[PDB]
Write an enzyme that holds these catalytic residues in place. Structure first.
Site, PDB file in Angstrom:
ATOM      1  N   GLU A  99      -2.659  -6.106   4.275  1.00 11.32           N
ATOM      2  CA  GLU A  99      -1.912  -5.119   3.501  1.00 11.32           C
ATOM      3  C   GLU A  99      -2.760  -4.559   2.370  1.00 11.32           C
ATOM      4  O   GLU A  99      -3.552  -5.275   1.762  1.00 11.32           O
ATOM      5  CB  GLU A  99      -0.648  -5.762   2.936  1.00 11.32           C
ATOM      6  CG  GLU A  99       0.194  -4.905   1.973  1.00 11.32           C
ATOM      7  CD  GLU A  99       0.825  -3.744   2.687  1.00 11.32           C
ATOM      8  OE1 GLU A  99       0.158  -2.693   2.808  1.00 11.32           O
ATOM      9  OE2 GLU A  99       1.965  -3.915   3.190  1.00 11.32           O
ATOM     10  N   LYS A 150      14.062  -7.859   8.388  1.00 11.10           N
ATOM     11  CA  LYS A 150      12.660  -7.910   8.801  1.00 11.10           C
ATOM     12  C   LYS A 150      12.518  -8.493  10.196  1.00 11.10           C
ATOM     13  O   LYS A 150      11.769  -7.971  11.032  1.00 11.10           O
ATOM     14  CB  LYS A 150      11.839  -8.751   7.818  1.00 11.10           C
ATOM     15  CG  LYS A 150      11.969  -8.379   6.365  1.00 11.10           C
ATOM     16  CD  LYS A 150      11.258  -7.091   6.058  1.00 11.10           C
ATOM     17  CE  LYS A 150       9.987  -7.344   5.286  1.00 11.10           C
ATOM     18  NZ  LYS A 150       9.170  -6.102   5.347  1.00 11.10           N
ATOM     19  N   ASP A 190       1.084  -8.215   7.079  1.00 13.46           N
ATOM     20  CA  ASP A 190       0.537  -8.372   5.707  1.00 13.46           C
ATOM     21  C   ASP A 190      -0.654  -9.330   5.702  1.00 13.46           C
ATOM     22  O   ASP A 190      -1.659  -8.979   5.091  1.00 13.46           O
ATOM     23  CB  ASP A 190       1.573  -8.922   4.738  1.00 13.46           C
ATOM     24  CG  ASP A 190       2.651  -7.925   4.407  1.00 13.46           C
ATOM     25  OD1 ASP A 190       2.350  -6.941   3.731  1.00 13.46           O
ATOM     26  OD2 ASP A 190       3.762  -8.157   4.832  1.00 13.46           O
TER      27      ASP A 190
END
Ligand SMILES: O=C(O)c1[nH]c(-c2ccc(-c3nnn[nH]3)cc2C(F)(F)F)cc(=O)c1O
Ligand SMILES: [Mn+2]
Ligand SMILES: [Mn+2]
Length: 178
Positions: free
Chosen positions: A62, A116, A90
Protein backbone atom coordinates in the site's frame (compact mmCIF):
# COMPACT_ATOMS: atom_id res chain seq x y z
CA UNK A 1 -10.33 24.36 7.16
CA UNK A 2 -8.89 22.87 10.37
CA UNK A 3 -8.99 19.27 9.10
CA UNK A 4 -6.16 19.83 6.63
CA UNK A 5 -4.30 21.88 9.25
CA UNK A 6 -4.60 18.92 11.63
CA UNK A 7 -3.54 16.34 9.03
CA UNK A 8 -0.46 18.41 8.35
CA UNK A 9 0.18 18.67 12.12
CA UNK A 10 -0.12 14.98 13.03
CA UNK A 11 1.04 12.98 9.98
CA UNK A 12 4.62 12.97 8.82
CA UNK A 13 5.32 14.75 5.50
CA UNK A 14 5.86 11.49 3.53
CA UNK A 15 2.46 10.13 4.61
CA UNK A 16 0.77 13.42 3.65
CA UNK A 17 2.40 13.51 0.21
CA UNK A 18 1.35 9.88 -0.36
CA UNK A 19 -2.26 10.48 0.68
CA UNK A 20 -2.39 13.66 -1.43
CA UNK A 21 -1.10 11.74 -4.47
CA UNK A 22 -3.66 9.03 -3.74
CA UNK A 23 -6.38 11.71 -3.69
CA UNK A 24 -5.15 13.47 -6.84
CA UNK A 25 -5.21 10.15 -8.74
CA UNK A 26 -9.00 9.81 -8.93
CA UNK A 27 -9.62 13.58 -8.93
CA UNK A 28 -10.40 13.95 -5.22
CA UNK A 29 -9.25 17.20 -3.58
CA UNK A 30 -7.84 17.11 -0.03
CA UNK A 31 -9.13 20.66 0.69
CA UNK A 32 -12.74 19.56 -0.06
CA UNK A 33 -12.72 15.90 1.00
CA UNK A 34 -10.91 16.67 4.22
CA UNK A 35 -12.32 13.62 6.04
CA UNK A 36 -11.25 11.27 3.25
CA UNK A 37 -7.84 12.97 3.46
CA UNK A 38 -7.61 12.21 7.20
CA UNK A 39 -8.76 8.63 6.62
CA UNK A 40 -6.12 8.17 3.90
CA UNK A 41 -3.32 9.40 6.12
CA UNK A 42 -4.52 7.27 9.04
CA UNK A 43 -4.74 4.03 7.07
CA UNK A 44 -1.41 4.76 5.42
CA UNK A 45 0.18 5.27 8.82
CA UNK A 46 -1.28 2.07 10.22
CA UNK A 47 -0.01 0.07 7.25
CA UNK A 48 3.45 1.53 7.72
CA UNK A 49 3.50 0.84 11.46
CA UNK A 50 2.35 -2.72 10.82
CA UNK A 51 5.20 -3.48 8.40
CA UNK A 52 7.72 -1.57 10.54
CA UNK A 53 6.89 -3.92 13.43
CA UNK A 54 8.55 -6.62 11.29
CA UNK A 55 14.93 -9.76 8.25
CA UNK A 56 11.81 -7.96 7.04
CA UNK A 57 8.66 -9.95 7.84
CA UNK A 58 6.32 -7.65 5.92
CA UNK A 59 6.48 -6.27 2.41
CA UNK A 60 4.46 -3.07 2.12
CA UNK A 61 2.26 -2.94 -1.00
CA UNK A 62 0.00 0.00 0.00
CA UNK A 63 1.18 3.51 -0.85
CA UNK A 64 3.14 2.36 -3.91
CA UNK A 65 2.00 3.42 -7.39
CA UNK A 66 -0.26 0.73 -8.96
CA UNK A 67 2.54 -0.22 -11.44
CA UNK A 68 5.08 -0.76 -8.69
CA UNK A 69 2.55 -2.37 -6.35
CA UNK A 70 1.38 -4.97 -8.86
CA UNK A 71 5.07 -5.59 -9.78
CA UNK A 72 5.69 -6.40 -6.05
CA UNK A 73 2.55 -8.64 -5.82
CA UNK A 74 3.36 -10.50 -9.10
CA UNK A 75 6.95 -11.05 -7.87
CA UNK A 76 5.73 -12.44 -4.53
CA UNK A 77 3.31 -14.70 -6.42
CA UNK A 78 5.90 -16.13 -8.83
CA UNK A 79 8.47 -16.84 -6.14
CA UNK A 80 6.09 -18.19 -3.47
CA UNK A 81 3.37 -19.56 -5.71
CA UNK A 82 0.78 -17.72 -3.58
CA UNK A 83 -2.52 -16.99 -5.34
CA UNK A 84 -2.64 -13.61 -7.10
CA UNK A 85 -5.30 -11.43 -5.39
CA UNK A 86 -8.02 -9.61 -7.29
CA UNK A 87 -7.59 -6.28 -5.48
CA UNK A 88 -4.10 -4.95 -4.67
CA UNK A 89 -3.64 -5.80 -0.95
CA UNK A 90 -1.84 -3.84 1.83
CA UNK A 91 0.94 -6.13 3.03
CA UNK A 92 2.65 -9.44 2.40
CA UNK A 93 3.67 -11.59 5.41
CA UNK A 94 6.78 -13.62 4.64
CA UNK A 95 6.59 -15.49 7.93
CA UNK A 96 3.00 -16.63 7.47
CA UNK A 97 3.34 -16.38 3.66
CA UNK A 98 0.05 -14.58 3.12
CA UNK A 99 -1.19 -11.22 1.97
CA UNK A 100 -2.92 -9.01 4.54
CA UNK A 101 -5.71 -6.44 4.16
CA UNK A 102 -5.72 -3.74 6.85
CA UNK A 103 -8.93 -1.92 7.72
CA UNK A 104 -9.46 1.12 9.92
CA UNK A 105 -13.07 1.85 10.88
CA UNK A 106 -15.04 4.40 12.90
CA UNK A 107 -17.90 1.85 13.03
CA UNK A 108 -18.09 -1.51 14.77
CA UNK A 109 -15.15 -3.68 13.80
CA UNK A 110 -17.35 -6.59 12.77
CA UNK A 111 -19.45 -4.45 10.38
CA UNK A 112 -16.29 -3.33 8.56
CA UNK A 113 -14.76 -6.82 8.73
CA UNK A 114 -17.79 -8.37 7.01
CA UNK A 115 -17.67 -5.56 4.44
CA UNK A 116 -13.99 -6.27 3.61
CA UNK A 117 -14.35 -10.05 3.64
CA UNK A 118 -17.33 -9.89 1.29
CA UNK A 119 -15.38 -7.38 -0.86
CA UNK A 120 -12.36 -9.66 -1.29
CA UNK A 121 -13.97 -13.14 -1.08
CA UNK A 122 -10.39 -14.49 -1.53
CA UNK A 123 -9.94 -17.02 1.28
CA UNK A 124 -6.16 -16.51 1.05
CA UNK A 125 -5.92 -12.81 1.98
CA UNK A 126 -5.73 -12.20 5.75
CA UNK A 127 -7.89 -9.41 7.20
CA UNK A 128 -6.99 -7.26 10.21
CA UNK A 129 -9.42 -4.50 11.20
CA UNK A 130 -8.58 -1.77 13.71
CA UNK A 131 -10.93 0.77 15.28
CA UNK A 132 -10.36 4.10 17.05
CA UNK A 133 -11.67 2.46 20.24
CA UNK A 134 -8.92 -0.04 20.91
CA UNK A 135 -10.70 -2.91 19.19
CA UNK A 136 -9.43 -5.19 16.48
CA UNK A 137 -10.84 -8.07 14.47
CA UNK A 138 -8.91 -10.44 12.26
CA UNK A 139 -9.41 -13.56 10.15
CA UNK A 140 -9.54 -16.64 12.41
CA UNK A 141 -8.54 -14.25 15.23
CA UNK A 142 -4.95 -14.50 14.08
CA UNK A 143 -3.67 -11.06 14.93
CA UNK A 144 -0.24 -11.67 13.36
CA UNK A 145 1.54 -9.09 15.60
CA UNK A 146 2.60 -9.37 19.24
CA UNK A 147 0.59 -7.55 21.90
CA UNK A 148 2.89 -4.53 22.15
CA UNK A 149 2.78 -3.87 18.39
CA UNK A 150 -0.99 -3.99 18.23
CA UNK A 151 -1.11 -1.74 21.32
CA UNK A 152 1.17 0.81 19.65
CA UNK A 153 -1.27 0.83 16.74
CA UNK A 154 -4.41 1.00 18.90
CA UNK A 155 -2.87 3.83 20.93
CA UNK A 156 -1.96 5.91 17.89
CA UNK A 157 -5.45 5.48 16.46
CA UNK A 158 -7.12 6.50 19.72
CA UNK A 159 -4.76 9.48 19.82
CA UNK A 160 -5.76 10.66 16.34
CA UNK A 161 -9.39 10.39 17.37
CA UNK A 162 -8.75 12.38 20.54
CA UNK A 163 -6.81 15.06 18.65
CA UNK A 164 -9.69 15.36 16.20
CA UNK A 165 -12.04 15.65 19.17
CA UNK A 166 -10.04 18.40 20.89
CA UNK A 167 -10.29 20.26 17.54
CA UNK A 168 -14.02 19.41 17.26
CA UNK A 169 -13.44 17.37 14.08
CA UNK A 170 -14.39 13.95 15.47
CA UNK A 171 -18.17 13.95 14.94
CA UNK A 172 -17.75 14.90 11.29
CA UNK A 173 -14.98 12.34 10.84
CA UNK A 174 -16.88 9.42 12.39
CA UNK A 175 -20.11 10.17 10.51
CA UNK A 176 -18.19 10.37 7.20
CA UNK A 177 -17.56 6.76 6.15
CA UNK A 178 -15.87 3.51 7.35
O1 LIG B 1 -6.94 1.80 -2.04
C1 LIG B 1 -6.83 0.97 -1.10
O2 LIG B 1 -6.05 -0.03 -1.19
C2 LIG B 1 -7.66 1.17 0.15
N1 LIG B 1 -8.57 2.33 0.15
C3 LIG B 1 -9.40 2.58 1.36
C4 LIG B 1 -10.38 3.74 1.45
C5 LIG B 1 -11.56 3.62 0.72
C6 LIG B 1 -12.50 4.62 0.77
C7 LIG B 1 -12.26 5.73 1.55
C8 LIG B 1 -13.33 6.83 1.62
N2 LIG B 1 -13.62 7.61 2.71
N3 LIG B 1 -14.64 8.43 2.37
N4 LIG B 1 -14.99 8.17 1.12
N5 LIG B 1 -14.20 7.18 0.63
C9 LIG B 1 -11.09 5.84 2.30
C10 LIG B 1 -10.13 4.84 2.26
C11 LIG B 1 -8.83 4.98 3.08
F1 LIG B 1 -8.87 4.20 4.21
F2 LIG B 1 -7.73 4.68 2.33
F3 LIG B 1 -8.70 6.27 3.47
C12 LIG B 1 -9.33 1.65 2.57
C13 LIG B 1 -8.41 0.49 2.56
O3 LIG B 1 -8.35 -0.22 3.51
C14 LIG B 1 -7.58 0.25 1.35
O4 LIG B 1 -6.72 -0.84 1.37
MN1 LIG C 1 -4.87 -1.02 0.27
MN1 LIG D 1 -6.65 -1.34 3.56
Amino acid sequence: SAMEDFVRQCFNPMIVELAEKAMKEYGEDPKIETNKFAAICTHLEVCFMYSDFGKHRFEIIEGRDRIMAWTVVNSICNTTGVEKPKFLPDLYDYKENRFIEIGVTRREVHIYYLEKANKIKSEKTHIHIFSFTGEEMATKADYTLDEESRARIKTRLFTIRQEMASRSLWDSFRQSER
